[PDB]
């Protein structure tokens, strides 16, 4: 096999050592890569701080209600640690089903933040590009690395290329 590029909807990129989301390209000069430092910085901020929100912040000191070195009456001992086993059951249940809801949301959210960037590029090029269906856009004009940085940079003034593009899109 040789060449070929693909985006999300096909597989994740294994050469992404710096950043969560990013771009790739290929033109008459050569291939390349670069990450989108804005969006990746928002997601990392939200996700990594969820551990501290799970910690209780209404601390109440607890004492001892039974002796570790002397016996306790049988009648009250049973009641003392029938409650304990029934309270440990609520916390154990409340933790499994509460982390799972945080895990579920993180997976869904981070995937939506990616489809928002793909649709941001789509509306930026306008009538000068068509989607091939594998997460990339096929530019219908010849534009160099000064254009690719523009698309990343959000400075792409499409109005100056429309004349040259629509000639190729509709095949004169």
């Amino acid at each position, epitope marked *: 096999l*040789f060449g070929a590029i693909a985006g999300f909807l096909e597989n994740g990129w294994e*050469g992404m050592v710096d950043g969560w989301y990013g771009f790739r390209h290929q033109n008459a000069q*050569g*291939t390349g890569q670069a990450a989108d430092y804005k969006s990746t910085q928002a997601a990392i901020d939200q996700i990594t701080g969820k551990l501290n929100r799970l910690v209780e912040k209404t601390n109440t000191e607890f004492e001892s209600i039974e002796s570790e070195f002397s016996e306790i009456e049988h009648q009250i001992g049973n009641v003392i640690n029938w409650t304990k086993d029934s309270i440990t059951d609520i916390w154990t249940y409340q933790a499994e089903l509460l982390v799972a809801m945080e895990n579920q949301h993180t997976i869904d959210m981070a995937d939506s933040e990616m489809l928002n960037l793909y649709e941001r590029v789509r509306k930026q090029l306008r009538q000068n590009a068509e989607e091939d269906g594998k997460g990339c856009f096929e530019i219908y004009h010849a534009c160099d690395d000064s254009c690719m940085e523009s698309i990343r940079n959000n400075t792409y003034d499409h109005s100056q290329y429309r004349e040259e593009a629509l000639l190729n899109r509709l095949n004169i």
Partner: antibody
Amino acid sequence: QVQLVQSGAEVKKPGASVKVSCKASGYIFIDYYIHWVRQAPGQGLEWMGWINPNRGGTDYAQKFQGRVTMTSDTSIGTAFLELTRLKSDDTAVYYCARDRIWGGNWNPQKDDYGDRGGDYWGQGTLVTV
Amino acid sequence: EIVLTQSPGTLSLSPGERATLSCRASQSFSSTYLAWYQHKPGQAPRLLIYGSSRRATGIPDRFSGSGSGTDFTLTISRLEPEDFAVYYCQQFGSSPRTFGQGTKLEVK
């Protein structure tokens, strides 16, 4: 995990030619350039050239121009260095180092990307002449 | 053809001190075009700094460097027993890419 391996030692008389081979695994061989660095006994590190496995482009230092040759076979994932017209000064240890960025320019002579450098350097082979 | 020269001398120091190495070039180029390697006998080199200002993967914090324009420097905050080796300076400014002479390091 990445790992670059190559052939063993060799001995060749003056006027002959040698072919060192540097095989890679654990990643996609097409991307990333491939360096080639030697070190004659007691001498510093000399830079020979590098190749772009995507299309076979190569670039050599002026000192080796017309003598060195580089090749790549994606089907096997091996990068080759062929050296001709051996002299008594060609005795050294030849390495092979992968780069650390994904880019490329179809002609590494005109590449201008930023922070890059050899990584996953291989082990090196001793060629005696 | 850019040619690089390094601070000469083996620069013998005693363990626990602070060392400093410098790399100078003929003409200026961007600070991103540089890297630092550490070479120990019998082994392939290792990448320490890329771009002259960022540490490689898994590199101990004690290694750091800085510089801009004509002068580039590498600083080892504290010297340990297991880092006495030859250090190299390479530039990615313009083909050919070239290595420096190399600076040795030895205990007192």
